[PDB]
């Protein structure tokens, strides 16, 4: 259903190239939604979507030296946004 592994594969002081194991999501899945926000912060997370055929995404415009919570949700072609997202904490 949903991916199960999520990593940063490249980094700059203000940006992260992430990767998730999309191959583990069923063929029903037509996009992924990525959210990110300062861990422990007040502000609502920022979010964008990518095509279900992507296993990679760039998160950019981050503050340097800050811990971010990064979440990947699966999107189903009928129901839409699914539950049980995958998340990591990662510091720029």
């Amino acid at each position: 259903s949903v991916p199960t592994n999520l990593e940063v594969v490249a980094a700059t002081p203000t940006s992260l190239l992430i990767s998730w194991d999309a191959y583990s999501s069923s063929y029903y899945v037509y996009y992924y939604r990525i959210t990110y926000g300062e861990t422990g912060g007040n502000s609502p997370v920022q979010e964008f979507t990518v095509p279900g055929s992507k296993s990679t995404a760039t998160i950019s415009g981050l503050k340097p030296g800050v811990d971010y919570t990064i979440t990947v949700y699966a999107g189903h072609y009928l129901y839409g946004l699914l539950s049980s997202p995958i998340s990591i904490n990662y510091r720029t």
């Binding site: 594969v9 194991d21 999309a22 069923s26 063929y27 095509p51 055929s53 009928l78 839409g80």
Partner: protein
């Protein structure tokens, strides 16, 4: 291996199918065992790629195209008579490249679902809906709420006046012929976008919001399929299921999913399989046994569908199915879902006009061309590898074919290098990096040009290009990645391939 084992998912009437399988044995002697393995559709291609899998696989037709693209299914040969026992539109759902590959069994499609107490006479036309909502809003209610996020739900309106996903003719889909930005699609999406801008509907309504608003009586209609009936039964809404509204005098065109049974091509009981399905399963007797275990909904057998249609909900499902479009079973359907999803969000919110949004979606969903990475190195899809004149016009003299099933289409005219890997985590694609890098250099030194391709030109072939830029420039993966991505924005090596590329990074920089 062995000599009939039938795979079906557990959500369905497998016990009832076991019965039509004992009633088989008491007629044939030969035994049929019905197992319902978990993650069934994921296990079948794993195990049937070698052999030791079932003889007959049951599943929605849309995944059978991937199966057939891998050869895992046999070309069923149904009597010309037997085909008339099924509705003719169902046979279109079970072909790949023109050949039949499954027997149609059951059929689902969206319908109009309405609250009989709020609205005993649901509108027959989309155009009626704004007046009706103006009336209901003055009572605190709304006319219609349904999922606006997924193109699967909005497409029936967008298609009514002429839109379509991929043109289908003579048993084949033409992935160059996308009907997203024609006049019919513009008119339907303009109507939709107008319902939102006039606050008859909300741009944020998704599956959950819609399903709760209707089952709590806040809205007079929703749009949904038979999977949703159980939750409405639980609620205090007296509901009906009916034909979708027309738009500009023409029916709404929901996508149609055809539950289907395929024959394992790597199995000898191909005759015992044809025997069981053609003459023991798809009979009034056969489907009823399955139906009694767990209902099938609308069914593809005309005789037994007449029976079930006594339920007006099932009759409405079949009627919307017969006016709808078969769900394309080709891999390009995924880019279509995402492209239309962006179009609807951007038009519904005013970020783009209907025309700009559909035009960009047309471009995203329809096939493009190869992409120049380096003057002697191009990147693209399996589609491109079959257009000889187009490659000849680019000066391509050699292809790298990164696939398990794609032919070299013009052997002897181009030099071919095969890299036979699947796009999954198990595939050791980096053990081909050196060999592929030498081929590209070899062709380059002889003055030629290499076209590197995989099915979608997204994961496998991009990985080969990225590795080439890395060894050849002694640069890091994130630099190669940025380079290709700016030329072909969709490239995305799979998770395991990104790891293999990172391992390769520290080798070429040591």
């Amino acid at each position: 291996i062995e000599e009939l084992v039938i795979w079906i998912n557990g959500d369905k009437g497998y016990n009832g199918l076991a019965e039509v399988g004992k009633k088989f044995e008491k007629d044939t002697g030969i035994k049929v065992t019905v197992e319902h393995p978990d993650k069934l559709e994921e296990k079948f291609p794993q195990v049937a790629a070698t052999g030791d899998g079932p003889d007959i696989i049951f599943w929605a037709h849309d995944r059978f195209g991937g199966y057939a693209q891998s050869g895992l299914l046999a070309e069923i040969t149904p009597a010309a008579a037997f085909q008339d026992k099924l509705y003719p539109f169902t046979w279109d759902a079970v072909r790949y490249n023109g050949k039949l590959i499954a027997y149609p069994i059951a059929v689902e499609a969206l319908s109009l679902i309405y609250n009989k107490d709020l609205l005993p006479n649901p509108p027959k036309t989309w155009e009626e809906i704004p007046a009706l909502d103006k009336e209901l809003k003055a009572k605190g209610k709304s006319a219609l709420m349904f999922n606006l996020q997924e193109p699967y739900f909005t497409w029936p309106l967008i298609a009514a006046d002429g839109g379509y996903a991929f043109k289908y003719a003579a048993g084949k889909y033409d992935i160059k012929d996308v009907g997203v930005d024609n006049a019919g699609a513009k008119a339907g999406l303009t109507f939709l976008v107008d319902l939102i801008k006039n606050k008859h509907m909300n741009a944020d309504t998704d599956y959950s919001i819609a399903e709760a608003a209707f089952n709590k009586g806040e809205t007079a209609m929703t749009i949904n399929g038979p999977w949703a009936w159980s939750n409405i039964d639980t609620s205090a809404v007296n509901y009906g299921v009916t034909v979708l509204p027309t738009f500009k005098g023409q029916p709404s065109k929901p996508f149609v999913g055809v539950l289907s049974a395929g024959i394992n091509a790597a199995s000898p009981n191909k005759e015992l399989a044809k025997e069981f399905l053609e003459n023991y399963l798809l009979t009034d007797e056969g489907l009823e046994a399955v139906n009694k275990d767990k209902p099938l909904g609308a069914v593809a057998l005309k005789s037994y569908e007449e029976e079930l249609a006594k339920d007006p909900r099932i009759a409405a499902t079949m009627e919307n199915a017969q006016k709808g479009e078969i769900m394309p079973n080709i891999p390009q359907m995924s880019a279509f879902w995402y492209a239309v999803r962006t179009a609807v969000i951007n038009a519904a919110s005013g970020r783009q006009t209907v025309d700009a949004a559909l035009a960009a979606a047309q471009t995203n969903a329809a096939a493009g061309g190869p992409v120049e990475i380096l003057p002697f190195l191009y990147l693209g899809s399996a589609y491109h590898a079959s257009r000889k004149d187009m490659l000849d016009a680019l000066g391509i003299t050699a292809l790298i074919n990164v696939s398990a099933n794609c032919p070299n289409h013009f052997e002897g005219h181009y030099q071919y290098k095969s890299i036979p890997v699947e796009d999954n985590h198990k595939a050791d694609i980096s053990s081909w990096f050196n060999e592929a890098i030498d081929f590209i250099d070899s062709i380059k030194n002889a003055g030629g040009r290499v076209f590197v391709h995989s099915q979608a030109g997204i994961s496998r072939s991009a990985t080969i290009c990225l590795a080439y830029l890395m060894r050849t420039n002694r640069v890091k993966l994130d630099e190669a990645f940025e380079f290709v991505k700016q030329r072909r924005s969709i490239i995305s090596p799979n998770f395991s391939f990104m790891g293999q590329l990172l391992q390769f990074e520290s080798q070429v920089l040591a």
